[PDB]
């Protein structure tokens, strides 16, 4: 979202997701513990 609010900033994509889970009241540790699993669901979802 930084590019929207000001100067575009570099950020690993996994880092973005961590914030987003934190945005919905989910501890970011969950993501990293399931990064691979989450990706496949996302990858499968876009195909469906």
């Amino acid at each position: 979202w930084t590019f929207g609010a000001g100067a575009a900033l570099q950020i690993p994509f996994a880092m973005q997701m961590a914030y987003r889970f934190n945005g919905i009241g989910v501890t970011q540790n969950v993501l990293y513990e399931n990064q691979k699993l989450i990706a496949n669901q996302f990858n499968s979802a876009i195909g469906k």
């Binding site: 690993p12 996994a14 990293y32 990064q35 691979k36």
Partner: peptide
């Protein structure tokens, strides 16, 4: 974790414990 990196997390309680030990 993927991409985790090595480092040491300092403990604020340790110095007090060490001084208390002394």
């Amino acid at each position: 974790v993927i991409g985790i990196v090595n480092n040491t997390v300092y403990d604020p309680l340790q110095p007090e414990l060490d001084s208390f030990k002394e």
